[PDB]
Design a protein around this ligand. Sequence first.
Ligand SMILES: Cc1ncsc1CCOP(=O)(O)O
Ligand SMILES: C=C1C=NC(C)=NC1=N
Ligand SMILES: [Mg+2]
Length: 225
Amino acid sequence: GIRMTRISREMMKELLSVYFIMGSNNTKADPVTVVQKALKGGATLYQFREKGGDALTGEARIKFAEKAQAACREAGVPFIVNDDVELALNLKADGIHIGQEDANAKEVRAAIGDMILGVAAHTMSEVKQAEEDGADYVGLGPIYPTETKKDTRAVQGVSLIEAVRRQGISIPIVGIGGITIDNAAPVIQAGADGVSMISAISQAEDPESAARKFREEIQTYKTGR
Ligand SMILES: Cc1ncsc1CCOP(=O)(O)O
Ligand SMILES: C=C1C=NC(C)=NC1=N
Ligand SMILES: [Mg+2]
């Protein structure tokens, strides 16, 4: 249900383990079917991100969001909305994710009560500002090269993740950008609480198996660090 209190850091870190993000234009298969498969395989959190070319709009976009949210309910996984604060409130989403060029975080926190709030950050200053504004987690990247999102900041590897932890900041962190089954380990080793991805799952020949592999791997990495 809706949160009457801010999510705990311990719980937030658990949800970030395998954070699947997807829109209808990120796969050649049926969108909802791919989300259902990712959830069955083991994704721990899902972000509805519908934007850019050939993306759905109007009520068609709302209906797709409703179907994806229903799939999350069936799987017992939280549903996060990207960018659209109004849609998140209208659908009773579990959270909202925003970036540096979107609505201001302090303004968004005030509009959503105790809903989960994620903020994309690329510098130490941005990470610190996000925490002060009331974010529950920060998405750091691009860790590796990605073409899924064109307008991205420079690739930073795990440098920022390491820098944040070295300064004593314990805010929940999820890495993003070109993450695959074979390169996720360093992200968790650097201090991240999880990995987020689009194409490694959305464009996989077997999305369920990919999600299951991620879930198994991340659990091992987190216990090993
Ligand atoms: C949404 C987003 N934000 C920064 S990189 C990125 C794209 C992630 O896509 P992929 O996992 O396919 O690189
Ligand atoms: C840019 C992003 C960064 N991090 C996350 C978790 N989602 C995003 N859309
Ligand atoms: Mg954004």
